Amino acid sequence: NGAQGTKFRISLGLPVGAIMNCADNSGARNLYIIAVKGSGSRLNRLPAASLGDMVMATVKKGKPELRKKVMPAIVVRQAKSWRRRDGVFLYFEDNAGVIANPKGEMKGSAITGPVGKECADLWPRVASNSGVVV
């Protein structure tokens, strides 16, 4: 909920314990922590996801006012080899991170760099805050 649309499947690149980039100027530089929403439950398996997936995270590098604080938000770049259902495999330069509330609304107001097509179609406020899609 909060997202507009179905649970669609794109390959997994970002297990738990993965530091990925934030490039907006909300203040953060990095995102780490545990959790992935809509993750299964299997013995010995890591929670790892994308598809504009929402995840729990902390600022490892950034301002202290928002360090030490767990927060939800959404994957926008992955750098794994994803497949578009229209032809080719896609992949980015890097992973990218960035911050929001549980309804999908952003703490920041603009995004740097490209954002995934399916991530923007699934999350409206990301599409409004993004100037660059793909």
Chain positions contacting RNA, by CB under 7 A:
1, 5-9, 11-20, 34-48, 56, 70, 78-81, 83, 89, 94-95
89 binds another protein (CB under 8 A): yes
Binding part of the chain for another protein, among 49-57, 63-71, 87-95, 100-108 by CB under 8 A, reads 87-95
Residue of 70, 25, 50 lying closest to 122 (CA atoms)? 50
Q: What are the structure tokens assigned to 5, written together?
A: 């649309």
Binding part of the chain for another protein, among 4-12, 52-60, 64-72, 102-110 by CB under 8 A, reads 4-12
For residue 71, the tally of other CB atoms under 10 A from its CB is 18
Q: How far is the CB of 112 from another protein (least distance, A)?
A: 9
Q: How far is the CB of 133 from another protein (least distance, A)?
A: 8
What angle is formed at CA 117 by the lines to CA 74 and CA 42, rounded to 5 degrees? 50
Cα Rg for the chain, rounded, in angstroms?
14
Residue 91 CB contacts under 8 Å (≥ 6 apart), including other chains:
78, 79, 80, 81, 82
Q: Footprint of another protein on this chain (CB under 8 A)?
A: 5-6, 8, 42-44, 79, 81, 85-94, 113-114, 132, 134
